[PDB]
């Protein structure tokens, strides 16, 4: 369910609802879908929806580059 929540969140929050061509491999920052300066808005959504602690002291920001990477990170945190 997390992968789908994240795709819908980016479609709704950043692309005015259009899922056209957006998938789990889309590079969100490289294509300027998410402003580099808005990363902590994604982190907040991910922490809230995933119910795992996400400490940015210890978690590489590359983990937020794609939906796939955000999902992979939560799998690693859920041990």
């Amino acid at each position: 369910m997390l992968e789908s929540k994240l795709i819908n969140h980016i479609a709704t929050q950043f692309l005015d609802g259009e899922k056209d061509g957006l998938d789990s491999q889309t590079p969100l920052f490289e294509l300027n879908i998410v402003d580099s300066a808005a990363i902590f808005d994604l982190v907040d959504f991910l922490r809230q929806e995933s119910k795992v602690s996400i400490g940015m002291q210890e978690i590489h920001p590359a983990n937020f580059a794609t939906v796939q990477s955000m999902v992979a990170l939560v799998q690693r945190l859920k041990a």
Partner: protein
């Protein structure tokens, strides 16, 4: 023909008097002043042996100790350097190289080849910025300009050899002139922040603490990121005594969130200017006054400069403390570029050779000094990066489906939205937003890739697009 550049004389004296003092930190590496100056002399010898004098040397290098040595090596051999943002697409670096026509490109291979073996030039560097035609636009930076700025900035910040300066920006941008050259002038250390670290709030916070950074200079957008990260606090940042922001406004709501993250005694300054002037207007924040301010002033022109505001009638009013007027800021004095290296910009052509620059910024004079109001042309700041809408338009017009294309912009607090308005060729498949972003990804850096698309039957044009009409066609179509 010119005095020895004051920055080179200072750098040589520090290698002589304090050879073992740290000059530069980068990743796990550091150089003292002896190592930096010795390396710069080795590279200068190679440029001399190649018979390069009075020439452009383009530094196609990542942020590194060797890239700083190459800057000094160009000056020591009578040459000027062309820096580039190593993070941008290769096709844009190729367009800069074509525009700059350098005598020599220093790249990783050139350094590898090297390691396996009377100042006449008034120009120190040429910074190639976004050009309204698509052609990159070279801003000549003189030794006189750098000396003027650095001597002002050292005095303003009371910089000394005990300081540790961050270097956030790419060498392509003029913030790096303070971070590198003010440091070298006083015999301080500079932390070269690598491309992989520039957006990485944990790596920045860890480095501020590890290196005991005392002076930080950046755009507001990375300071506001560090605030939002929750990682910046006055204990981790206890060494910070001066924070300087420049390149775009810092909205007062956001700036009030940053101040509790910094040591109470830390001086916070707003520095203003385009590449053509470096910093030419400055304000030191009074934390007591800040609660009552709706905008942080850019402040007053540097000592030794003069300013005029050009009103809506085209009449130039001399800046005085008493002036209460909005107009285009025109700056005069030794900060002003002798001119563009490779293009003619008629608005500046009878200003630059008279040491005057028309900033394109609408500003207001107030009891607290100048206040930035907005731009009056098609150049926009995107998180403090300089973007000509005409550069993005020039690339979009090459898409096979596109007839005409124009951008417009929506501005918010530490946010900008670029909107592509396009018409199609007869019979063309309409491109989607993500398809056009993928088209631009090979060609322009991420901050120039627009995030909205509007397809229209026809773009409004005159007897050139009528930009006044774009917001309205976007409104109607939305």
């Amino acid at each position: 023909t010119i005095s020895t550049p004051v920055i080179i004389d200072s750098l040589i004296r520090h290698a002589q008097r304090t050879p073992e003092q740290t000059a530069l930190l980068c990743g796990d590496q550091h150089w003292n002043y002896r190592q930096l100056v010795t390396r710069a002399h080795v590279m200068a010898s190679a440029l001399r042996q190649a018979g390069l004098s009075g020439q452009a040397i383009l530094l196609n290098l990542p942020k590194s100790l060797d890239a700083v040595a190459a800057i000094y090596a160009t000056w020591l051999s009578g040459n000027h350097y062309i820096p580039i943002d190593y993070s941008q697409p290769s096709s844009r670096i190729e367009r800069i190289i074509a525009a700059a026509a350098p005598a020599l490109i220093i790249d990783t291979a050139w350094l590898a080849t090297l390691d396996s073996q009377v100042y006449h030039n008034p120009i120190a560097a040429i910074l190639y910025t976004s050009g309204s035609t698509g052609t990159p636009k070279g801003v000549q930076i003189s030794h006189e300009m750098l000396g003027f700025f650095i001597q002002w900035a050292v005095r303003d910040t009371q910089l000394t050899a005990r300081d540790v300066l961050s270097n956030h920006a790419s060498f392509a941008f003029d913030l790096s002139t303070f971070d590198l050259f003010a440091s070298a002038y006083v015999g301080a250390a500079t932390w070269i922040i690598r491309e992989s670290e520039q957006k990485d709030c944990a790596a920045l916070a860890q480095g501020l603490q590890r290196h005991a950074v005392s002076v930080w200079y950046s755009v507001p957008s990375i300071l506001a990121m560090l605030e939002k990260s929750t990682l910046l606090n006055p204990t981790l940042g206890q060494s910070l005594r001066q924070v300087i922001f420049a390149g775009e406004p810092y909205p007062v709501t956001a700036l009030k969130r940053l101040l509790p993250c910094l040591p109470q005694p830390c001086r916070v300054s707003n520095w203003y200017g385009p590449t053509e002037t470096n910093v030419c207007v400055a304000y030191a924040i009074d934390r007591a006054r800040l609660a009552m301010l709706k905008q942080v002033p850019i402040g007053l022109p540097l000592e030794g400069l003069t300013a005029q505001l050009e009103d809506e009638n085209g009449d130039r009013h001399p800046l005085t403390a008493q002036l209460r007027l909005s107009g285009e800021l025109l700056i005069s004095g030794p900060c002003v570029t002798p001119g563009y290296s490779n293009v003619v910009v008629p608005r500046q052509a009878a200003l630059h050779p008279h040491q005057c620059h028309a900033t394109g910024d609408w500003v207001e004079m107030t009891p607290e000094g100048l206040v930035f109001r907005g731009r009056i042309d098609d150049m926009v700041k995107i998180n403090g990066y300089r973007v000509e809408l005409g550069e993005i338009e020039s690339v979009l017009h090459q898409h096979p489906a596109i007839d005409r294309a124009a951008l417009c912009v929506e501005l918010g607090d530490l946010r900008q939205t670029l909107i592509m308005v396009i018409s199609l060729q007869t019979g063309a498949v309409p491109p989607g937003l993500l398809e056009l972003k993928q088209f631009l990804q090979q060609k322009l850096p991420s901050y120039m890739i627009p995030n909205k698309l509007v397809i229209t039957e026809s773009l409004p044009v005159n007897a050139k697009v009528d930009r006044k009409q774009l917001a309205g066609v976007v409104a109607v179509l939305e």
